[PDB]
Amino acid sequence: MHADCAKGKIEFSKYNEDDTFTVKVDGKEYWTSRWNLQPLLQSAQLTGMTVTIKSSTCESGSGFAEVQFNNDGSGSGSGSGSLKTSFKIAFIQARWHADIVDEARKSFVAELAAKTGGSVEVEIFDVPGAYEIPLHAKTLARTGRYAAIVGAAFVIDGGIYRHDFVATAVINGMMQVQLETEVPVLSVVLTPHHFHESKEHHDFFHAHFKVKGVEAAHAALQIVSERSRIAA
Amino acid sequence: MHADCAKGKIEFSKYNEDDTFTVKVDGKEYWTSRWNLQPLLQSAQLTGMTVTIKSSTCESGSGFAEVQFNNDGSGSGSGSGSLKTSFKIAFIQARWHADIVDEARKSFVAELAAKTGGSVEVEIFDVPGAYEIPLHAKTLARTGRYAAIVGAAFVIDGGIYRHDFVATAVINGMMQVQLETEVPVLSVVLTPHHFHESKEHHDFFHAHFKVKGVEAAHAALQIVSERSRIAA
Amino acid sequence: MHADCAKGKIEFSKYNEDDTFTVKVDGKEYWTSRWNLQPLLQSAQLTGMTVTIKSSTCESGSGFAEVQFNNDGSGSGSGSGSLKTSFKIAFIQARWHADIVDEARKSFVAELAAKTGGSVEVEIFDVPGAYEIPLHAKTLARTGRYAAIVGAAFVIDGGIYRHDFVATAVINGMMQVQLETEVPVLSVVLTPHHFHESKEHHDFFHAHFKVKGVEAAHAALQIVSERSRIAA
Amino acid sequence: MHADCAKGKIEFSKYNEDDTFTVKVDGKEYWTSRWNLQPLLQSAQLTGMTVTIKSSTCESGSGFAEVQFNNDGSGSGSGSGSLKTSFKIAFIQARWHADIVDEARKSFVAELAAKTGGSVEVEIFDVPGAYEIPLHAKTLARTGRYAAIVGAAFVIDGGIYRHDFVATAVINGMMQVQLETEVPVLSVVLTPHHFHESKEHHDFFHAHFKVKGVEAAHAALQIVSERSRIAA
Amino acid sequence: MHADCAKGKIEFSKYNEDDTFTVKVDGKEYWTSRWNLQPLLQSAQLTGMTVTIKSSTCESGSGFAEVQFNNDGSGSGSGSGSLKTSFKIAFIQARWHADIVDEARKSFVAELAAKTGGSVEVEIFDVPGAYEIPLHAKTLARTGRYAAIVGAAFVIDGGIYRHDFVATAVINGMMQVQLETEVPVLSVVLTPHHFHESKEHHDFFHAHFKVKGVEAAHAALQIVSERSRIAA
8 A cells, every 4th residue: 555645634735836826735745747647636725725845755845646535535524433342432511510510421431430340431521511511512523533422401490581592592503413414412501390409409400410421321332333334 | 238347326536637537436546538427427416326337348557438318416415215115214222221211122023923924024223222223223324225214212201300301302303303314203202101110110111112013013013005006 | 589509507528629609408418619718618617607698509519609698507597486377385294193294195185176176286205304394495496397295194102201302392493494495385284282192193184184184284385375476 | 898698687597418528607698618618617507606607709609718707606696785876775665554655755755865866766666564674675685786775664563463573573684684684674663552543643653654754765775875884 | 825915805806808818906907818817807707706816017907927826715704803812802782772782782891891801802893683683693793804793682572572582583583693604603682581571670681681791791602602613
């Protein structure tokens, strides 16, 4: 198989005055004198694809005439999963009412470590409020590296303003993001019927979120396994 | 038609240094020395289309110059139906309150088998909860092979958290997926007015879901037949 | 004006080793030896363009060198209307509570026939339930041939499950479809405040839908006339 | 600057057998014998752009070799505004409860004429019901010529059917249209809490809509001025 | 590195009769006689990309043969952020109930000046009402120059018409805009449960918006810092 001098997206394409198309791939600049390669290189650059420069000399500023396009490159793609039995999960948590989302996250991580035992790694991403979750989830989904995304928050009616608009927007936005990027997004954003901060609700919801974390961990594991199964 | 050596999507396109464009179709690598075929092959690869390799020699690494493009290839297309009087249906069921979705599914399958008698086959897909249904439906619709998709769940107000957000998101997402992929999606996700788990509701909803399964089977058959009719 | 051997979408394009983009248009296969025509034919095929093969010989397998592209071909386009003072309307009706949608449809057809007197033709399409209307409307709008689409249903709260989710989904889906395809869609899907099946509601809603049919007929005629007016 | 024989969208492109690409622009047919211009003309036609045919002879059927592409042509573009201090506004009004929308429209027009004094022209468009406003707004926004669009209606709960579905659909559709076409759309569709047709409500809402018309006029003027300001 | 005669979007492309492709970049007109550059220049123009004309002579009407395409140009892109530790924020405020949004804005600006001390600059944009916020936010997001966008309004039930439709539309449209343009948009649009203008509510909501401004300032700083962090 031919040597891969550099693989990655074209950082910049420069058509020099000597009929050479200089393209920078994976931090290394390569140029080609082929007339047919110039429109192909331009199309590759404008399509957001990753090309692999192939030549006998892999040094900077070396000519090349061999290149491979697997399937419209990689670009922002190559996501929607990492590997079976070894993947990663992103846990986005809001910092409003942190003392309960913390319990949910601790239960989730503990259960995942108990079952998988190191096969699954969970990364924690902090976020100011429930409204900021859909965009963060979209970014983490398009970046790849993740087989599932979990978002946790505690949306509370404070008795002054109405809270249902933000909850509806967040739920619908998470659904839209997961449909757009084809990465599962599990919802642990919960809106109680009543919460008047009487320390009885405070004691109750700690344990209830402790249970919800384990439930979400099991759901995430099973959905990732099933999605990997039906793709074969 | 010419001898079809291999038909399928271009797994990878490799432009070698000898002015040859090597493309792998249906697991077999083929190369062209034609200058005009290279931009056409690149466009075919970037457009997500399937080409048909036509040549006298069908062995690996054999050159070819004949290719046929039916209609922008197949790619992710060729779905939205399998065949009249012989097709498949995907039954996505949630595992929350399984004892009732099970009754609905059994009624659906029994009625299907009663009328069609083996003409329609039902494949069964499990899912953690109602929130995971739209993405599974989108995947199964884009994969083709299915003339209709059925999603069943039982969304319950548990008395602690509000449940209407998830139900609204699920219904709207199922409709959006159905409009996006042009594959009918029938909804058997139901939200009762009251359910307090007093075994009276438990005994009632078993039979009611038993009825709903037969109703959904009839609706699926009729809608598939009508959609096949108006397309001629 | 040059003779039209065949006009329509390219059924299949076959670039043989002979470097000839053999193309089947309107059920007739035509081939060209022009080098410049091959990329143009490929672009037309991938863009869903309808080409008109023009040559002195219109028989199958005859060479051609003349072709006309009016405006990106026709493809799935040429819809959003048929002709002024002579067009068609699609009436999609649900089969749930058929005894009332029947009254609405009869009123609509009778009023149309009374005013236009044969200038407007109404085609009836059957559908199992309200949830299956938006996709049927999208298909009938994309197929062309129709200046307006009418969808009728009777969404009823049965006292067991909640019904507002499906009604909201249907209304929003019809609006989305009519915005997408630029074909007016008139809504005759109605949700009464109360309906307990006491034969008083049954007697009342027959006449009320009888009125609604005439109202919808007048609205459809007015909107089609106005839309045809502002487009000049 | 070179003479403009004809400027507009390519009505039809015809590649004759004499290696000439005949294109009709602004009602005049022009042909070119340049080999390089043919793919460029095809791309211009398929991209929905307007080209300006330039030649020493501007008569029909005259050869040309000069053409200018400003920015992907005009096509459906050139909208989202007409000119500062002199623009147009489209007033779409529903014919349901006309006696109140009439007061709103009269107030709007009178206030516009009082402040601008002929600098702003208001065009009136009639529509059978509130459900048919968003598509009309989308058409009038895509056609250009308008810096703002106003939609007025009176959505009323009649006591028989539920009315909130249509109102929600209309508001969301108007917002979606204004986001899609980048033309401001001001909402004067109003849903009162109670209206039982007791002639007290009828007398009150006349004056209230009279006030709302002036309010909408001021809002439209200020938003158009601000949008024109931030674009420099 | 080669001299930059002019960098920017192609204002207009003019293919003269002398086989020269004149392109205006950054207010300066440049022409090239290269046959291969003409399709590349046309593709660059139609793709909405910015090219950098490079030649030994940078004067108007000077020939060039060198050009660089970094990554599909800039065009409407280059947004979603300005720089770390030194960026800008757009504060869109509605003029309905200005005496409270003013308090919110003053708190926001004061807190940002207290912490950053001149590192972050806030620009104030006026808007007639809550309905006009999402489109303004979309414009300011697409123009670039901003790492975050804040929208403030006070949606009030006046006791005559229903207000929840507009609030829902505004929240959903703001979330849709922030997902479309990948620029965070923080919500300070608030809908109180009750507000009867008895000057007790007027005194209370002044201080409450004073608090909400500081809260939004902290949330904006945190979200910008985190988004800049995860992008490395």
